[PDB]
Design an enzyme around this catalytic site. Sequence first.
Site, PDB file in Angstrom:
ATOM      1  N   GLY A  38      -9.795  -4.414   1.066  1.00  0.00           N
ATOM      2  CA  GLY A  38      -9.203  -3.901   2.295  1.00  0.00           C
ATOM      3  C   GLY A  38      -9.604  -2.429   2.455  1.00  0.00           C
ATOM      4  N   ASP A  39      -8.862  -1.740   3.278  1.00  0.00           N
ATOM      5  CA  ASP A  39      -9.215  -0.351   3.668  1.00  0.00           C
ATOM      6  C   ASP A  39      -8.846   0.663   2.625  1.00  0.00           C
ATOM      7  OD1 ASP A  39      -6.438  -1.005   4.454  1.00  0.00           O
ATOM      8  OD2 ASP A  39      -6.423   1.076   5.154  1.00  0.00           O
TER       9      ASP A  39
ATOM     10  N   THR B 223       0.844  -1.221   0.000  1.00  0.00           N
ATOM     11  CA  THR B 223       0.000   0.000   0.000  1.00  0.00           C
ATOM     12  C   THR B 223       0.869   1.257   0.000  1.00  0.00           C
ATOM     13  OG1 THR B 223      -1.730  -1.207   1.066  1.00  0.00           O
ATOM     14  CG2 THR B 223      -1.733   1.183   1.372  1.00  0.00           C
TER      15      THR B 223
ATOM     16  N   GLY C  34      -1.467  -1.132   6.484  1.00  0.00           N
ATOM     17  CA  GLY C  34      -1.314  -2.319   7.329  1.00  0.00           C
ATOM     18  C   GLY C  34      -2.518  -3.240   7.036  1.00  0.00           C
ATOM     19  N   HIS C  35      -2.994  -3.872   8.086  1.00  0.00           N
ATOM     20  CA  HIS C  35      -3.992  -4.923   7.924  1.00  0.00           C
ATOM     21  C   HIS C  35      -5.316  -4.242   7.796  1.00  0.00           C
ATOM     22  CE1 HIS C  35      -0.893  -7.687   9.762  1.00  0.00           C
ATOM     23  NE2 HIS C  35      -0.973  -7.935   8.471  1.00  0.00           N
ATOM     24  N   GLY C  36      -5.811  -4.280   6.569  1.00  0.00           N
ATOM     25  CA  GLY C  36      -6.972  -3.502   6.172  1.00  0.00           C
ATOM     26  C   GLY C  36      -8.222  -3.771   6.934  1.00  0.00           C
TER      27      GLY C  36
END
Lengths: 270, 280
Positions: B167-168, B137, B189-191
């Site tokens: 994801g985000d 990202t 990071g972790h979406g």
Amino acid sequence: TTNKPIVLSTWNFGLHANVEAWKVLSKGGKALDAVEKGVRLVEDGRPDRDGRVTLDACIMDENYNIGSVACMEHIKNPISVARAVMEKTPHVMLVGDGALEFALSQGFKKENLLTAESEKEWKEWLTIGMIALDAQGNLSGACTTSDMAYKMHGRVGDSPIIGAGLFVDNEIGAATATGHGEEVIRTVGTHLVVELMNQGRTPQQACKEAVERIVKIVNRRGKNLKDIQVGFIALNKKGEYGAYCIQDGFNFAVHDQKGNRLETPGFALK
Amino acid sequence: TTNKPIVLSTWNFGLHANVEAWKVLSKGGKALDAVEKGVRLVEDDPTERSVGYGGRPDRDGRVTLDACIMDENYNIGSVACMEHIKNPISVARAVMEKTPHVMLVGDGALEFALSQGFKKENLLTAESEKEWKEWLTIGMIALDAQGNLSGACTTSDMAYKMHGRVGDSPIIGAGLFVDNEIGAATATGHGEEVIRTVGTHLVVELMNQGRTPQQACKEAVERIVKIVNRRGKNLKDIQVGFIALNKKGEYGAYCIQDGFNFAVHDQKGNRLETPGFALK
């Protein structure tokens, strides 16, 4: 002072949905099962401009678990596929063909969702949200939308976007939106309502203040308030509730120990 | 006192991307054009495998990309799970500018992109296809010389995800949020965890309440940390970074785990900076 259980949902049809939710809530069942059952009633589509019925749904439980599907075809109960995304995968959102492939892998049945009526009306041309607080004092919420209104293929509205069409924080409260999807997204409206409750506002104050901030955004954008509908309904942890909209004309269904009824929000555009 | 123009971006490769954004900002150009240019640089680079061309595919070998963009006046556009288009940030800007919608996904996003003159390409490199066949990202925000904020977020993540996972990165309020009266933030990071918390909307609302950008990023991370524990999950498994700018050009960042840096370019120069982290 706590009022529970209680369930709120959008529009006249919310009344009917609230009866199904209450079958769960009044027996001491979970908010999560009550909202899923409530919005399945309504699920049981005007297509996009290409004649495809595509559906969006979001579900959020009392412990920050979430599931969402967007632009999914062929599956009649997208709220239940959203629930399966939440419970059976490590993701929170699946879209398009991949949401369908998932749903099939979980045993959902592929169906034709376009009625010959809707097809004929399409050839001619050329939402429910629900939030509940259960007997345990836990919140959950669900929303689902089926009218694509001949929009572009692959358009996503506010229903499947966490913080837009729906938001739940079990420590604070919950909110679900009505009105134009693109406007609810750009303003992150239900996250704003819940965060305002976190800051000490009542559900009623939080809905009003969110709408008032949004009205100012609409003005900064040089748009006319008559052309924009955004509204919210909300619940806190004590079972107080509130609702407010830019424009008059919306109603919502509320069911608690006083029974079920349709109420009207306050509105900004006098 | 206002530090502008200034641009921030996520990760080390943000340093080189900031140079591209600065070519616009240093000439008095618009924040929106700078952030588009800056992230397009990373989308174009096949050796940056977390963004655009060169992206690791989903589990079935498809490179699906997500992006969104937000200007100084609540204009937004997004694409998600889009195939065959190298520069999804530019398709997102076209969603924003050329349609009455704010988000398109899947095949509809591709059909639109081709309708606007974007070209179908093969985004799967030989290198990415082997790592796959084996296996079985960037966010950027800027304050321009006029004092306007804009931002952009573009990704190929996460590697070998289920087909259709989003994801985000393309979700306004999760991956990116900009309000020209307050500030801007972008995440990485972790979406799933940035979605769950609506992370960038929360950062900007914390700045609205008076938090410094750094304090706002730090409180937003701490909320994720709380939630991770409430869910019985292990913080070691989770990384999230937020960067933020306010209307005076003050900036800040915070993350869950060590190892996240951001790049910041202002009139004094371009710097790789290392923010605080929660997991001690």
